[PDB]
Design a protein around this ligand. Sequence first.
Ligand SMILES: Nc1ncnc2c1ncn2[C@@H]1O[C@H](COP(=O)(O)OP(=O)(O)OP(O)(O)=S)[C@@H](O)[C@H]1O
Ligand SMILES: [Mg+2]
Lengths: 39, 115, 261, 261, 261, 50, 145
Amino acid sequence: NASSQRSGRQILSQLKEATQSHQVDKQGVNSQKPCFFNS
Amino acid sequence: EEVDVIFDEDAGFLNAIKTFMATTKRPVILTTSDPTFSLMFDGCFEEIKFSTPSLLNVASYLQMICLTENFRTDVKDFVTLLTANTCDIRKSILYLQFWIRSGGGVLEERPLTLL
Amino acid sequence: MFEARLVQGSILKKVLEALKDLINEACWDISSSGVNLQSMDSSHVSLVQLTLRSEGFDTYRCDRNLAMGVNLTSMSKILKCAGNEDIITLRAEDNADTLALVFEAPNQEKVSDYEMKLMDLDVEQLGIPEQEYSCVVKMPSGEFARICRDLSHIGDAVVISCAKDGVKFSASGELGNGNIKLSQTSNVDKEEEAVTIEMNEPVQLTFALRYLNFFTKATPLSSTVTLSMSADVPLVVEYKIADMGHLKYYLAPKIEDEEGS
Amino acid sequence: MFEARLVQGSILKKVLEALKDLINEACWDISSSGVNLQSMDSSHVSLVQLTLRSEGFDTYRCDRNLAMGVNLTSMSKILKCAGNEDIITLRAEDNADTLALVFEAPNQEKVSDYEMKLMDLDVEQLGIPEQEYSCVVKMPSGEFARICRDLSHIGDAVVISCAKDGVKFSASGELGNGNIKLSQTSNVDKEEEAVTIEMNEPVQLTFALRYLNFFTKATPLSSTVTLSMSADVPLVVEYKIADMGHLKYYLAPKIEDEEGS
Amino acid sequence: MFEARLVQGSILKKVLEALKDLINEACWDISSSGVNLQSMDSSHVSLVQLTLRSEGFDTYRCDRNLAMGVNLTSMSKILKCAGNEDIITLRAEDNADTLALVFEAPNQEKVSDYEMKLMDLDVEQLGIPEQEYSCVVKMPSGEFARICRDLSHIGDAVVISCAKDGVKFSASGELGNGNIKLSQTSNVDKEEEAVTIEMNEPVQLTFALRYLNFFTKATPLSSTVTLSMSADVPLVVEYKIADMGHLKYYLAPKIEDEEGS
Amino acid sequence: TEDMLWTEKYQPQTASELIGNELAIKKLHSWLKDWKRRAELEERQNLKGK
Amino acid sequence: HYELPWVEKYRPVKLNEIVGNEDTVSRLEVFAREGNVPNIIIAGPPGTGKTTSILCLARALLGPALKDAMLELNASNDRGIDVVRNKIKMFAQQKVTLPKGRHKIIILDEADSMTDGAQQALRRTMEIYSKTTRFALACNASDKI
Ligand SMILES: Nc1ncnc2c1ncn2[C@@H]1O[C@H](COP(=O)(O)OP(=O)(O)OP(O)(O)=S)[C@@H](O)[C@H]1O
Ligand SMILES: [Mg+2]
């Protein structure tokens, strides 16, 4: 979101492995939506 | 959400997302409200357009919502409310929530078969 | 009502510098057994599970189970004034918005009290069940950091390939290819650099390099490391905290775009 | 006709970086007693005072009293290119509009000279009497710098309190509250200072973070600093420079309001 | 099919540290007689030369010559995980684009199997005069590094004069002319350490501090180094390991600009 | 006794529960079905490889 | 002893004491009585009672927790991008124990001095934390929002 900090280096360093890897918790509590931010 | 909103703090964001789409293996969804973002942004992407919904359908939907909360209300009032909001669903839903939980506007009986 | 008297705060320093940028908030799940932390990172592809046993603290008191989500930037700030040798007091009420950190400086009386609010996380504890790992490895601390930094100097994706001798780490980058094999160095003076392997089957996975760098940033707190890795499971990097507890690292492997024949 | 010989230019560089952001301009008045500066903030909430005795300079010469005003930014631009070990000359004429800074050679091969125009301004002698303060402490400067920069990122304002127990710092920020307690038995080991009180009554006031951080920009002048504090007469920060003079600081507290019922 | 076997890691780990930022490309001429390195600076001022012999290596094998080319930084990153006591082995194929690097185990059973991509450029031939020099001196290496590091604080160009009184290194710059002159007599804990001169005519030139500081990074190879200086040719520094080969680095003089008369 | 807005009370759990823009939601749902099928096929490839 | 201005000496403390716009007054009264108020944008002429109605609504809904579950921004505060980045999100995430149906409350006094990008940032924050946090705003010209 625009409400959180979204700068290029930060978003790349904290969101690239979301699409370059598997998910560590593939079972259980999965349908929650963490708002991505860096305070 | 709102790729169109770019600040000076948001430095190199369009280049960043270009790199994301370039190197992704998972689905990426961009949403925005402006039509101009389609022309200034360069890349390969599938486009999906949401038109303004039909007034009578969302009027019936809001009327079911107020019916579930034990309120009966005419269609034309909701049509006026939606056209005042330019058929905005969240605006009409939120103002309906306010106006319902306040206890309703005017108590007038209207016998309609089509209590 | 919760009270902890951490006999030493430098271990908290080391674990937080291990997790100062990977995970975003820290969760404390607290019962009679001890203090538990189940935090999944900003990419939500790696998990950190930290367990402190109740006997490790000077005093431990927990009237009921408590879950506190705390901002990590806040604790990263407050603890940079915490001494290398000191006593720390964790203070938490039953149903409050508060968490107090009491620092007794090495002066006769220099008490620093930092009170932080709670960030109200709706995500509970998360952790995999216990499963037999076909690849369990006793490996050293510092040289792991050296070879991760060398792979970082080479590439950005890590090939982990265990075999009968040990494991091979490969990294094919644009600068070049670097492949280092570790095997049975058990017959050595100290057991911390001893490598003994009790693996079952050779299996290969690939992982994010930078994550392995942050997880090996926690090298000097433990003398050795155990690794638990197998097929279709996260890589597990675990450290034993001598007389305090144990920490667990879970790594989802990199997704591979396998091509049909 | 005015000649001053600053023994070491490090002190002048230090006081300039101590007051670089505080004030619009520096207006010095010179007498046979010495040099004085009582300049009060552009936002009109604080005053810097500096008195340097004539004997502190290598050679101090005056013919009459003179008050001259100098823009701070160009003064900083000139002094930032001066060696700290250097011996400096400040020359002022009787009626000219230009002040001369004759720096000796920092490299022992190039004597530097710079000039500054005079800026006329209404400056009043804020002759406050030095009343007896109900709270007087001595406490090291570097610690006071580290604690203000500790509480600054916590709070936009600090509650100072002075009691018989000791001196106490609170800061209720949005992330949470930060508290620091000192004691009179609390003697530090960084610079070997025993914190003391000469207080009479407990007092609690509130001061902004920004000004206090830029008061701690005067840390390297003296090892210890004297804080004088009263229920009505505001905060006094006093550095006693060795054989040079004394550096007093007046900061008024923020008003406090009682919350309505 | 080329394979070289160096007996200890102390050789490469410091000769490459001498070339940390000197030449962008490690250019080898691999012959059956031995290994040569002929790499030339991008500033057209510094030439570097190595001649490793077959007798120094454990066993030398060559089927054909190589115009071998290695990138510097990645080779440094590969080098930084080499054991000091380990045996270095390197393989270059006939047509493949990989340079294999297998070292002995730093953990006594943990061996390396590295690769290195081959880069192909002009690999132009560099001519060496193999001439006579007006002044040759046998000189301690660590003391030369000490003098170079002491004079590097002052300026950028050092004047060097070699005569029968010895060498004179003067940094005529800003801070001061640091004059260091060493005679024939030099007394250490060893029985002999002579700064001896075998000269014909006294020579006087000017060299750069940065390249001299880079040259002094090859200190641990040889305790005694031969420095060659003539009137017109560049400075030649030759570290003779007496079993591996000779490190010959050539630095062009700084020509003094003749002002008009 | 409620503590939460009608927008999230009557928030559509299913894409079929959305009102209007039927073609757009069918295209989006088909695209996400194709992508989850691709992810499932990649998972099947991973288990087939090992 | 101090001459308190009558504008604040006689500002109402209970919602029924406010006159004008009586239908919205009754709606604010029933929302103070029961709770679970939605996000409110009061718009009107200056000096009408908007800030009074908002503050009295907050006081009636909270009570003793008015010093903690309530937070206020006016044009005297910063109200730039960085504060709507950090502070308001930190509070909207901040845990506060409250009675049932009672939510943490943020007041933006005279939101017409919000910059456009500040509102663009504020949208996601106000819409995702709606389970525990409600927003109230005041303005004179609605088009400035
Ligand atoms: N309807 C009212 N009933 C009672 N007192 C009122 C009323 N309107 C204003 N006042 C008084 O006048 C003051 C101003 O009220 P405000 O709510 O601040 O005005 P406003 O309608 O919010 O418009 P502003 O402040 O110019 S943005 C209050 O503190 C009361 O003392
Ligand atoms: Mg108002």
